[PDB]
Amino acid sequence: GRVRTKTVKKAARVIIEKYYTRLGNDFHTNKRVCEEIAIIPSKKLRNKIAGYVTHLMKRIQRGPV
């Protein structure tokens, strides 16, 4: 199957705790603000970050975690 990596976990936690305000629900808007925010090496890591943060903003906006 497929599993999320721990570096993606910690980077997305940093993004959530830092700039949740400009983040939203759309995938591409989250991806572009994510590539705007941080120091970023790779495309695939960015896309994994964007997908994970989009899914967890689908999660946490229903209720706190």
Partner: protein, 797 residues
């Protein structure tokens, strides 16, 4: 025992059989006991044996246990007065302090109440007298041996009493509910579990089926409704600060009572909601999920109007602080509204949403971006409730008119909410067109929502696929003439040369959506228009054309099926002619279309399938995983289709195989194609294809195990794994050595790369046979891998 079971002096023989129960030999006593039980259950002799019961119990310290075992085995087959007298005898013997005789007596009561005796054996008055006579014991709270079976026997007795006369049973139930709540204070978890299970079973079987006969209960009820309210106040006073340990069980009991009784118990049920809301205000509450489930069950039973009259939302417009204490109510309402009215949703949640959105925008334009985000998230949360309200509305025939223009404007100019609105529409349809006036209203507004949804899907950039699924179902529920009109307009837009490629693709997607919902003439005209498009050099146009052909052939009944049986010859000719010029993505829908014409293919069609075979195998090794899945499903489908063209299934399967056998001879990628096809076929047609024939194919695979290409070796390893899984160990044992010899002399690099497949194969072989045989017949290095498998078999245990 046999003689008396098969058949004045007979009473003497029965007395002689009965009188030696008290014989001290454990083997004689058990034989006599089983004989008496077989004679009675295989009756005019019940009075005599019950009199013997009472007499020689009253004469009697070890025979009482045996005699109570017979009473356990024989209480249902007794007359009513003798049941009463034996019950008095059991009370007289549990007046003593002995644990064993009390346990045997209560087990006898368990067997008596469990068998559900008729009116001749146990009456309602006698059941009530026995039940009320059992209330004197309850030694303490925490003995844990007699208490569980104690409330079990009057659980069964209360079930029987409700079954005999329901009003008296419901009348006497709530004081037992109060005693159950009282004995939920026990320090043992088994007492709590037994009480919870007993009260849950009583509520589900004795109270729930009589939900309509009781009717609505208020604070001034008279009959069994008062009893309903009074075990409600028992289980609600079981929520106080005395417990702190049974709160999960009490919440489960509250949840099942809400599901059982809420719709008519709503006037008295409010203070329980207030107390439940007050419990969630605790600093550290570990039963948050259970309380949320209980409140969700209450909302599901009643509906949010009375819940919000009881526990109101404090997010009504302008608030002072920023910590909403009842913000869990909106997820509860979203997750658990299923059978409410849509008019409440309109008249309560529309102006409040408008005011919160206006306040959020006014605060966002004023600089404060923290409160505005909270208000926007709140209004999004409270208007995700619409799919919940669209689950099963009871007034959607009159309240859907009040939301049509609102939902049209919201799906037009409010993008962030659009998906939910689409979902709501889909949700409504998927479970709301059961009646006919409802579906008529949905069609009457469908004629208005269709241009809006078409313009939404056709705009440039957006959630296109949710709108497309909504359009698909929403057009399956509408009238055919407007479908024909919009299909004609979409065909005009497609055939217009002054349209861009994105617009052309969007209108082709609309054609895909409109295709299965039209009539036979419109479908035939659309098929005539789309038929020249199958040879287009653009992969997108061919993909949409093949999707149209798949969608018109997808419906098992309707105008599409009549179109298929009308134009099967032309469809076969066109699909065989367009085989050469099909693009790589277009393979994925086309196979499905071929799938959609294999399941209803007549006997005189072998040439079509035997011409489609190499395309299907080359699609089993296509790039797209969806094309591979469709090709495997199509292989299974034509394998099933050849099982209908002849009388012998095995011979037809052999013909189907010799139609695909030469594919192991040609190109290397075609060889891997055919090995993968045989691997997929071996898992579906395991024994019917014939074990010896399997062996032959297996031998050929060993020759293909000698190939240089990695793909052929991988496919051969997969086939060997499937064969080891499928074909029998007795037939394996003749052919273990040859296949494992072919594995052994593979290569160094091939063994190193494919180490996990060989490891799994050796694991399966060692599991299915002896370790020493595979150890001996393999070469040296493989031995090491072999021995590792052993600790799996050692340490998976």
């Amino acid at each position: 025992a046999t003689l008396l079971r098969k058949q004045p002096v007979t009473l003497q023989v029965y007395h002689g059989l009965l009188s030696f129960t008290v014989h001290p030999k454990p083997k004689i006593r058990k034989a006599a006991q089983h004989g008496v039980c077989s004679v009675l259950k295989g009756h005019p002799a019940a009075i005599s044996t019950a009199k013997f019961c009472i007499q020689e119990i009253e004469k009697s310290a070890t025979t009482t246990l045996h005699m109570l075992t017979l009473l356990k085995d024989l209480l249902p087959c007794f007359p009513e007065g003798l049941v009463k007298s034996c019950s008095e005898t059991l009370l007289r013997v549990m007046t003593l302090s002995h644990v064993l005789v009390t346990a045997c007596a209560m087990q006898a009561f368990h067997s008596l109440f469990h068998a559900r005796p008729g009116l001749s054996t146990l009456s309602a008055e006698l059941n009530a007298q026995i039940i009320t006579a059992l209330y004197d014991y309850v030694p303490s709270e925490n003995d844990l041996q007699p208490l569980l079976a104690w409330l079990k026997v009057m659980e069964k007795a209360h079930i029987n009493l409700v079954r005999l006369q329901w009003d008296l049973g419901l009348g006497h139930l709530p004081r037992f509910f109060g005693t159950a709540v009282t004995c939920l204070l026990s320090p043992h978890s088994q007492v709590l579990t037994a009480a919870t299970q007993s009260l849950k079973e009583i509520l589900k079987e004795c109270v729930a089926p009589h939900m309509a006969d009781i009717g609505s209960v208020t604070s001034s009820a008279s009959g069994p409704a008062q009893s309903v309210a009074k075990m409600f106040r028992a289980v609600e006073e079981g929520l106080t600060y005395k417990f702190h340990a049974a709160w999960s069980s009490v919440l489960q009991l509250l949840c099942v009572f809400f599901e059982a009784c809420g719709r008519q118990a709503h006037p008295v049920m409010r203070k329980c909601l207030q107390s439940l809301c007050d419990l969630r205000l605790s600093p550290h509450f570990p039963h948050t999920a259970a309380l949320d489930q209980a409140v969700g069950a209450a909302v599901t039973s009643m509906g949010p109007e009375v819940v919000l009259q009881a526990v109101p939302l404090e997010i009504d417009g302008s608030e002072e602080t920023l910590d909403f204490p009842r913000s869990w109510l909106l997820p509860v309402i979203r997750d658990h509204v299923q059978e409410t009215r849509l008019g409440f949703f309109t008249t309560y949640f529309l102006p409040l949403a408008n005011t919160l959105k206006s306040k959020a925008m006014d605060l966002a334009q004023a600089g404060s971006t923290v409160e505005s985000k909270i208000y926007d998230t709140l209004q999004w949360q409270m208007w995700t409730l619409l799919p919940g309200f669209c689950t099963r509305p009871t007034d959607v025939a009159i309240s859907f008119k009040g939301l049509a223009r609102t939902l049209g404007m919201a799906i037009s100019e409010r993008p962030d909410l659009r998906v939910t609105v689409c979902q709501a529409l889909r949700t409504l349809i998927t479970k709301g067109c059961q009646a006919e006036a409802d579906r008529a209203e949905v069609s009457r507004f469908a004629k208005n929502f269709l241009p809006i949804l078409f313009n939404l899907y056709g705009q440039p950039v957006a959630p296109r696929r949710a709108v497309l699924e909504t359009i698909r179902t929403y057009l399956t529920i509408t009238d055919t003439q407007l479908v024909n009109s919009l299909l004609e307009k979409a065909s005009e837009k497609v055939l217009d040369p002054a349209s861009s490629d994105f617009t052309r693709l969007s209108v082709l997607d609309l054609v895909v959506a409109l295709a299965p919902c039209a009539d036979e003439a419109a479908i035939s005209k659309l098929y005539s228009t789309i038929r020249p498009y199958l040879e287009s050099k653009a992969h997108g146009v061919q993909k949409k054309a093949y999707r149209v052909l798949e969608e018109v052939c997808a419906s098992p009944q309707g105008p599409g099926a009549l179109f298929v049986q009308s134009h099967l010859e032309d469809l076969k000719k066109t699909l065989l002619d367009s085989l050469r010029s099909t693009s790589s993505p277009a393979k994925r829908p086309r196979l499905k279309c071929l799938l959609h014409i294999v399941r209803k293919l007549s006997a005189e069609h072998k040439e079509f399938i035997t011409a489609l075979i190499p395309e299907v195998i080359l699609c089993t090794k296509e790039v797209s995983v969806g094309a591979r899945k469709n090709a495997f499903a199509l292989l299974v489908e034509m394998g099933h289709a050849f099982l209908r063209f002849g009388s012998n299934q095995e011979e037809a399967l052999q013909c189907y195989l010799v139609l695909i056998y030469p594919g192991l001879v040609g190109a290397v990628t075609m060889v891997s194609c055919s090995i993968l096809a045989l691997t997929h076929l071996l898992f579906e047609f395991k024994g019917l294809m014939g074990t010896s024939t399997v062996e032959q194919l297996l031998e050929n695979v060993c020759l293909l195990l000698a190939s240089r290409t990695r793909d052929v070796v991988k496919s051969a390893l997969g086939f060997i794994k499937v064969a080891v899984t499928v074909m029998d160990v007795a037939h394996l044992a003749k052919h273990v050595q040859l296949v494992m010899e072919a594995i052994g002399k593979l290569s160094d690099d091939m063994r190193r790369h494919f180490r996990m497949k060989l490891r799994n194969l050796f694991t399966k072989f060692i599991r299915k046979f002896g370790f020493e045989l595979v150890k001996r017949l393999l070469p040296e290095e493989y031995h090491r891998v072999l021995v590792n498998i052993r600790k799996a078999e050692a340490r998976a245990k």
